[PDB]
Amino acid sequence: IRKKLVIVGDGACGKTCLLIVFSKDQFPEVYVPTVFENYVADIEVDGKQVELALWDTAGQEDYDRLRPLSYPDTDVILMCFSIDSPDSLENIPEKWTPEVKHFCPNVPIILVGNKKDLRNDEHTRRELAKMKQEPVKPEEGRDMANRIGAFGYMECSAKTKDGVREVFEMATRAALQASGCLVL
Amino acid sequence: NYKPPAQKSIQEIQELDKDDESLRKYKEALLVPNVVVTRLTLVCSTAPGPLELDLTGDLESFKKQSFVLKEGVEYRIKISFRVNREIVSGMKYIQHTYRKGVKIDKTDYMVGSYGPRAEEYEFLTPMEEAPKGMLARGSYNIKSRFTDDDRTDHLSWEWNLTIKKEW
Ligand SMILES: Nc1nc2c(ncn2[C@@H]2O[C@H](COP(=O)(O)OP(=O)(O)O)[C@@H](O)[C@H]2O)c(=O)[nH]1
Numbered sequence: 145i146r147k148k149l150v151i152v153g154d155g156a157c158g159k160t161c162l163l164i165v166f167s168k169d170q171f172p173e174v175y176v177p178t179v180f181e182n183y184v185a186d187i188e189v190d191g192k193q194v195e196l197a198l199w200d201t202a203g204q205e206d207y208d209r210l211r212p213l214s215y216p217d218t219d220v221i222l223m224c225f226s227i228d229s230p231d232s233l234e235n236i237p238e239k240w241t242p243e244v245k246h247f248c249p250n251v252p253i254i255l256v257g258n259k260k261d262l263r264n265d266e267h268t269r270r271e272l273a274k275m276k277q278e279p280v281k282p283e284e285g286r287d288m289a290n291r292i293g294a295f296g297y298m299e300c301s302a303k304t305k306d307g308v309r310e311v312f313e314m315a316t317r318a319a320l321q322a323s324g325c326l327v328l
Numbered sequence: 329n330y331k332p333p334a335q336k337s338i339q340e341i342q343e344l345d346k347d348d349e350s351l352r353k354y355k356e357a358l359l360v361p362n363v364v365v366t367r368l369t370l371v372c373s374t375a376p377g378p379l380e381l382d383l384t385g386d387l388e389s390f391k392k393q394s395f396v397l398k399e400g401v402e403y404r405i406k407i408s409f410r411v412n413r414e415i416v417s418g419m420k421y422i423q424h425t426y427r428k429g430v431k432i433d434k435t436d437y438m439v440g441s442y443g444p445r446a447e448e449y450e451f452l453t454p455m456e457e458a459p460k461g462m463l464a465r466g467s468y469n470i471k472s473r474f475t476d477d478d479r480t481d482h483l484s485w486e487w488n489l490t491i492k493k494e495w
């Protein structure tokens with residue numbers, strides 16, 4: 145049973161690391177590619193075996209016309225922002241939701257807060273405070289999940305790996321639960 | 329709410345971050361008018377022969393003929409098409425079904441964004457059920473249309489469905 149997952153969200157919110165941590169189980173500290181090669185992970189959920197196809201994307205404005213080719217035949221979407229970037233969260237309803245709904249009507253979204261491990265980081269809090277901001281809070285995340293009609297809201301750190309296996313367990317559960325049936 | 333981005337050629341796309349290996353592979357993975365609609369097929373398990381329209385010319389031969397279909401049968405519509413030079417953004421498929429001059433259905437699907445490639449693309453709709461009963465046999469006129477984010481008009485062809493008691 146094949147399902148397709150595409151991961152979207154702003155540049156530098158941790159999309160690629162998340163994806164790499166999921167396939168390698170090691171956070172990359174040496175080099176982080178801009179976009180990780182799509183690949184096929186064999187996961188099992190709710191007494192069921194799943195061929196899961198994972199696509200990383202380029203979030204930049206510059207690739208707004210390129211990136212939407214990843215969408216056809218997508219079964220679940222991971223829509224990220226970073227817990228250390230309330231801007232990345234403002235763009236969820238301003239950019240990612242209008243896009244994902246446009247190209248992927250009827251397709252479940254899991255809203256994902258990345259970099260949990262920065263919530264209580266000292267240096268981080270200072271930087272945000274220097275522009276009158278704080279880290280995003282779980283209520284702010286869940287609220288957004290409701291506002292955009294997300295199947296779920298999960299939080300994670302790919303640095304510490306807390307939440308990673310649960311994010312993709314949810315995405316996969318979303319894909320099984322769930323315009324135009326198939327493009328080939 | 330969604331707002332289409334600035335038009336960008338495939339070369340403008342490749343010029344950008346052209347020294348990034350990882351983005352080079354990304355673009356490689358994902359990559360006469362630009363879009364050509366080639367064929368309309370009816371995918372139907374119970375049909376005794378193949379059900380196809382060639383749309384590469386002679387668009388003036390419906391309404392002279394049609395697809396015959398046994399009342400009550402399940403089928404999908406499969407549209408084939410070709411993208412020749414540049415990206416099509418967010419291509420949409422729209423269908424209006426007519427019966428005796430009355431519009432009985434309207435349906436439209438986000439087919440998606442597609443880059444140019446050699447082999448044609450095949451878009452399959454969800455399963456539909458042929459009509460049935462004494463009052464629903466004979467001809468339905470169908471207006472098929474494509475459009476996209478860079479185009480506020482359509483590619484249009486018009487085909488017929490003729491529903492019978494038997495095949
Ligand atoms: N502290 C922390 N940094 C992270 C985490 N995940 C990613 N990053 C960093 O944030 C930056 C952007 O990550 P990347 O995965 O390349 O983001 P993308 O551009 O959205 O894919 C990189 O320097 C990562 O090291 C995380 O979970 N915790």
Ligand SMILES: [Mg+2]
Binds near residue numbers: 156160177178179201
């Ligand atoms: Mg990236």
Ligand SMILES: [Mg+2]
Binds near residue numbers: 184
């Ligand atoms: Mg495998």
Ligand SMILES: [Mg+2]
Binds near residue numbers: 410412444446447448
């Ligand atoms: Mg083609």
